[PDB]
């Protein structure tokens, strides 16, 4: 790998912009959380804290090599999760807004550090593996509230896969050729993104059934 590529610089300027990006939404999303949440306000403020924090540290490794970000790209990557979000907020269905960002975008994150990391250059290894590291001290927020929940979330848990499973896969199939440049394969992506979400459902309460039709449900 070629760090000083035009064509890794390239990949570089989607892929950490989405990066930086998803910090942003990660922020803002909590925060709303909270208002959905009253009685969880300060705890989720305090995640909202970390994740502007992070998005500080993904910004210093854009400028580390000399990349502006390309932050339409990143708006337009996360922008069905985004929007499906807000609309849930609105109606208050704090369950599909937890889905989306604790479920989703947080698998996807793990899933993303996961192949990265390996293939990672120096000051960006150093970067991410601290975050990495910080953002595993911590449980997941909506796993636990989701498996607390998880009986009377089940119907809602379920809609809100049927509507953003698949925006998944399309989110992948847009990255494809920068993950390639930057030496990430999507079908690695793509394995290891569903061995964190069959995961995160089983901890939350669903059988391998459900897993298995919410999965079939990702497909269509
Ligand atoms: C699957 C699309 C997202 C993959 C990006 C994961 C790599 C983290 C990169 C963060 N950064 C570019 C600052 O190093
Ligand atoms: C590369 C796609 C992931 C974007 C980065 C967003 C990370 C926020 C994770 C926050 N968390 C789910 C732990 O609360
Ligand atoms: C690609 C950079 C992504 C940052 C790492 C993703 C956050 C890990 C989530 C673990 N958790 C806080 C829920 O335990």
Request: hydrophobic share 40%.
């Amino acid at each position: 790998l070629d760090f000083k590529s035009e064509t890794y610089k390239d990949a570089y300027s989607r892929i950490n912009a989405i990066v930086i990006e998803g910090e942003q939404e990660a922020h803002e999303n909590y925060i709303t959380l909270a208002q959905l949440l009253p009685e969880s306000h300060d705890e989720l403020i305090r995640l909202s804290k970390m994740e502007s924090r992070h998005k500080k540290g993904f910004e210093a490794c854009g400028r580390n090599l000399a990349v502006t970000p390309d932050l339409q790209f990143a708006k337009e990557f996360f922008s069905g999760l985004h929007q499906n979000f807000q609309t849930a907020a609105a109606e208050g269905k704090v369950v599909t807004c937890l889905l989306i960002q604790s479920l989703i975008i947080e698998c996807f994150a793990i899933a993303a550090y996961n192949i990265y990391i390996p293939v990672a250059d120096d000051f960006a290894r150093k970067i991410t593996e601290g975050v990495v590291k910080e953002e595993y001290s911590h449980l997941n927020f909506g796993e636990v509230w989701l498996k607390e929940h998880f009986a009377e979330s089940k119907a809602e848990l379920e809609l809100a896969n049927r509507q953003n499973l698949p925006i998944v896969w399309k989110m992948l199939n847009q990255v494809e050729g920068d993950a390639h440049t930057m030496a990430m394969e999507k079908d690695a992506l793509v394995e290891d993104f569903m061995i964190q979400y069959g995961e995160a459902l089983s901890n939350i309460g669903f059988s391998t059934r459900d897993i298995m039709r919410l999965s079939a449900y990702g497909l269509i």
